[PDB]
Write a protein that binds this ligand. Structure first.
Ligand SMILES: *[C@@H]1O[C@H](CO)[C@@H](O[C@@H]2O[C@H](CO)[C@@H](O)[C@H](O[C@H]3O[C@H](CO)[C@@H](O)[C@H](O)[C@@H]3O)[C@H]2NC(C)=O)[C@H](O)[C@H]1NC(C)=O
Ligand SMILES: *[C@@H]1O[C@H](CO)[C@@H](O)[C@H](O)[C@H]1NC(C)=O
Ligand SMILES: *[C@@H]1O[C@H](CO)[C@@H](O)[C@H](O)[C@H]1NC(C)=O
Ligand SMILES: *[C@@H]1O[C@H](CO)[C@@H](O)[C@H](O)[C@H]1NC(C)=O
Ligand SMILES: *[C@@H]1O[C@H](CO)[C@@H](O)[C@H](O)[C@H]1NC(C)=O
Ligand SMILES: [Zn+2]
Lengths: 195, 596
């Protein structure tokens, strides 16, 4: 009766920035989705390819939990075939994505009157991300034809930006913690069921 | 890379820090206006300075992306806003002098005062002293004191400054490729778009004149009616064929004849509709006032106020020691933060104000998806017209009855209908010739068409000819009576109120025809008309992203200022004036003066 480490991911005190989104491999445990309680206001639970309605009786080889924080406007982008600064440059899900995307408003946790600059997102990237790619590069974005010399300048911008969360922000700019449960099926033992 | 793609990315990095600093300012600016402390005053000016600093820097960086190579309007209109230099085109000599003059005129206006000839120790500041005199005194001489005293003890002090202000503003405009400072102000309405949605700066001149030439019939019969109902009081002081004395018009300048209503109400017996008593009798509070306004917009398909609106706004005077200048404000701070700063009292006028101010929020919320520099009214008059039609709909007996304020008693009569429209006309119709004439004067002043040794002489010639208003005291060139009005002294364009007034009735009429409204336009409540709300959102959500000529068309179906909706709003009063002026002189001889 080995309980899966979901309390680690959802209930963590600090979430990763979306650009440097954190993945937590989950294996050899009973997956208790049943207690993935409705955490916070504006709760969002979206599943693709498989049904969350108590279809725990399925087993999966490995189950990856990808967590990060984005603003409410960008939760729609954590879905197959979506475009935007997050889906293009920060976190991309495949077209054939089989999993679930969970999202709750975390304004009470991740905002600050002075602005929480801890959460970042990639604003610039010469290419969009292949599915589940992570880009933590901090190389200056060379918008221009002149080389940037690794320092911010004209036509040379830092690729990341801060969300600068303030509790007063509108719902569209408030922080939303997101956890993406990718379910993997290989010709493999399939060690994660959970009754 | 291309000078457009480079522009986009630059605007991306600008739109990030701007939206950051603009928020920081708006909050720090909100925290002062709701806490008024010298400490929060520093933070407000500091965040305002970091914001101004960034904008000034980015303006310079932006000019390096030539607009001639931009095709995307979302980039062009964004770049155009940032690229405009302003006073930063003058030498630091001229700029430091221009600021010195501007801050001087603003200080001379506020700190200035006029003293009684009877009581030379009663040096009364305009706000609130001389304003109480102009707005309430029925005494000819007490009104004559303040009017002449203000235009002398303040208006003369501004005369040398305004002469310099016109010169230093011209040099700023000409160096920014504008004919004069007036053509610079008219550039707000300039749209260089395709599809016949273009608009020239000079087209505003013709348009404002041509539309005024149709307000003239309304104004004359309002004038002859005001002149007659005025002539009852001040009897020997107002000629039956002459112009109106300027000090007898309500406001210190005659901007709003709103306060002539006690002396001009058609059927004074029939009481005004005041649901203020009905609100107290139902234990209404400020939150209820705004919840009803929220329900109003929701009825017409607009979103409710955000949660951050209810838990951040100041809908009541805070109290304690927390001073807050009680004046309605609608805050688009940014990052989805929408707030209203209002010392709401449970009255009808604050109820109507709450809808008006919440209209601003609906406009601010609608275009929040627009790029930051485009998050604004389609032009300077759009944002105010959207607010005004919110009080127009909410003030009708229909809306008051459906919300339980005015009892289910189907009130109204052919007399109270005339009373309200007369009250409206004093405010809305009365200001238009005042606004056109004042701004026409500045345009000719800036154009150079009026020599300085004839400024006042040409001003009062225009006042008599166009506004039908004459000075009680002759004024030589030591006066600068226009400068005795706030916007003139404080360097604010004024054709906004003219244009906004025309717009709001174009707005209201278009929405009311959408609303299947049967009957007079002034009785129209757009409530529950989700078809009208959609055409509104189609324009509201545009912001400044598209020309006002086109944005106006997404509501009213015309590319320009049409005054006929305004006339149709007052046709009931127009016909009733033509009869109550049948035996009266409609017009004015410009040579009559109360000083012989
Ligand atoms: C209205 O404004 C005043 C001052 O502008 C606010 O007073 C500040 O209140 C906060 C929280 O109550 C205090 O932390 C703050 O004191 C800080 O600053 C001083 C130096 O100024 C510092 O030495 C302290 O250690 C502390 O960090 C108060 N500052 C002042 C100057 O009074 C007040 O909260 C505001 N209230 C509202 C309702 O807006
Ligand atoms: C987080 O903690 C609460 C309180 O104990 C619990 O109900 C919830 O299941 C926890 N979340 C996860 C993912 O375990
Ligand atoms: C620009 O608009 C004006 C009216 O605003 C119109 O008269 C003029 O024809 C337009 N420009 C051109 C080149 O036609
Ligand atoms: C907000 O407006 C919607 C739209 O009609 C309405 O259904 C909803 O009830 C409103 N909000 C609340 C809290 O009632
Ligand atoms: C609008 O709808 C409400 C109920 O939704 C109704 O009571 C009211 O009479 C309608 N009309 C107006 C003008 O409010
Ligand atoms: Zn307003």
């Amino acid at each position: 009766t080995n309980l899966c480490p979901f309390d680690e991911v959802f209930n963590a005190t600090r979430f990763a920035s979306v650009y440097a989104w954190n993945r937590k491999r989950i294996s050899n445990c009973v997956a208790d989705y049943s207690v993935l309680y409705n955490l916070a206001p504006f709760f969002t639970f979206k599943c693709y390819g498989v049904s969350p309605t108590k279809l725990n009786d399925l087993c999966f080889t490995n189950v990856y939990a990808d967590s990060f924080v984005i603003r409410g406007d960008e939760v729609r982008q954590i879905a197959p075939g979506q475009t935007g600064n997050i889906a293009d440059y920060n976190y991309k899900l495949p077209d054939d994505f089989t999993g679930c995307v969970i999202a709750w408003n975390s304004n009470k946790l991740d905002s600050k009157v002075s602005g929480n600059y801890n959460y970042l997102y990639r604003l610039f990237r010469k290419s969009n991300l292949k599915p589940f790619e992570r880009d933590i590069s901090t190389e200056i974005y060379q918008a221009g034809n002149k080389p940037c010399n690794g320092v911010a300048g004209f036509n040379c911008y830092f690729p990341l930006r801060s969300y600068s969360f303030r509790p007063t922000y509108g719902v569209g700019h408030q922080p939303y913690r997101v956890v993406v449960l990718s379910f993997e099926l290989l010709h493999a033992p399939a060690t994660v069921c959970g009754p | 890379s291309t000078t457009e793609e480079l522009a986009k990315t630059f605007l991306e990095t600008f739109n990030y820090e701007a939206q950051e600093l603009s928020y920081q300012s708006s909050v720090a600016s909100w925290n002062y206006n709701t806490n008024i402390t010298d400490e929060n005053a520093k933070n407000m000016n500091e965040a305002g300075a970091k914001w101004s600093a960034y904008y000034e820097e980015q303006s310079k960086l932006a000019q390096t992306y030539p607009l001639a190579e931009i095709q995307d309007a979302k980039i062009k209109r964004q770049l155009q806003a940032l690229q405009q230099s302003g006073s930063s085109v003058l030498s630091a000599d001229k700029s430091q002098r221009l600021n010195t003059i501007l801050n001087a005129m603003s200080t001379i206006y506020s700190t200035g005062k006029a003293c009684n000839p009877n009581n030379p120790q009663e040096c009364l500041l305009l706000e609130p002293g001389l304003d109480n005199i102009m707005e309430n005194s029925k005494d000819y001489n007490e009104r004559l004191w303040a009017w002449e005293g203000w235009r002398a003890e303040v208006g003369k002090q501004l005369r040398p400054l305004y002469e310099e202000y016109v010169a230093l503003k011209n040099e700023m405009a000409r160096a920014n490729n504008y004919e004069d400072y007036g053509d610079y102000w008219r550039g707000d309405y300039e749209e260089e778009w395709t599809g016949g949605y273009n608009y020239s700066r000079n087209q505003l001149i013709q348009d404002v004149e041509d539309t005024f030439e149709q307000i003239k019939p309304l104004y004359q019969h309002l004038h002859a009616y005001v002149r007659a109902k005025l002539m009852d009081t001040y009897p020997s002081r107002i000629s039956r064929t002459g112009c109106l004395p300027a000090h007898l018009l309500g406001d210190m300048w005659g901007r709003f004849w709103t306060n002539l209503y006690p002396l001009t109400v058609p059927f004074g017996q029939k009481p005004n509709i005041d649901v203020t008593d009905a609100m107290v009798n139902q234990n209404w509070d400020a939150r209820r006032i705004f919840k009803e306004a929220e329900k109003f917009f929701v009825s017409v398909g607009l979103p409710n106020m955000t949660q951050g609106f209810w838990e951040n706004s100041m809908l009541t005077e805070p109290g304690d020691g927390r001073k807050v200048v009680c004046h309605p404000t609608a805050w688009d701070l940014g990052k989805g933060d929408f707030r209203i700063k209002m010392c709401t009292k449970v009255t009808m006028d604050d109820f109507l104000t709450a809808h008006h101010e919440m209209g601003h929020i609906q406009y601010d919320m609608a275009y929040a998806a627009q790029p930051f520099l485009l998050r604004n009214g389609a032009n300077e008059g759009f944002h105010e017209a959207v607010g005004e039609i919110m009080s127009l709909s909410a003030a009708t007996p229909n809306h008051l009855k459906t919300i339980g304020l005015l009892s289910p008693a189907f009130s109204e009569d052919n007399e109270t209908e005339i009373n309200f429209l007369l009250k409206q006309a004093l405010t809305i119709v009365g200001t238009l010739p005042f606004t056109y004439m004042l701004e026409k004067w500045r345009w000719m002043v800036f154009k150079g068409a009026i020599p300085k040794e004839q400024w006042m002489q040409k001003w009062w010639e225009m006042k008599r000819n166009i506004v039908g208003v004459v000075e009680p005291v002759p004024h030589d060139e030591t006066y600068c009576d226009p400068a005795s009005l706030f916007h003139v002294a404080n360097d604010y364009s004024f054709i906004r109120y003219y244009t906004r007034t025309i717009y709001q009735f174009q707005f209201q009429e278009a929405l009311c025809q959408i609303a299947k409204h049967e009957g007079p336009l002034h009785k129209c409540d757009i409530s529950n008309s989700t078809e009208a709300g959609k055409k509104l959102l189609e324009m509201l959500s545009l912001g400044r992203s598209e020309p006002w000529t086109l944005a106006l068309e997404r509501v009213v179906g015309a590319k320009n200022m049409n005054v006929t909706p305004l006339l149709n709003y007052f046709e009931p009063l127009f016909t009733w004036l033509k009869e109550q002026n049948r035996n009266s002189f409609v017009g004015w001889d410009t040579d009559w003066r109360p000083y012989s």
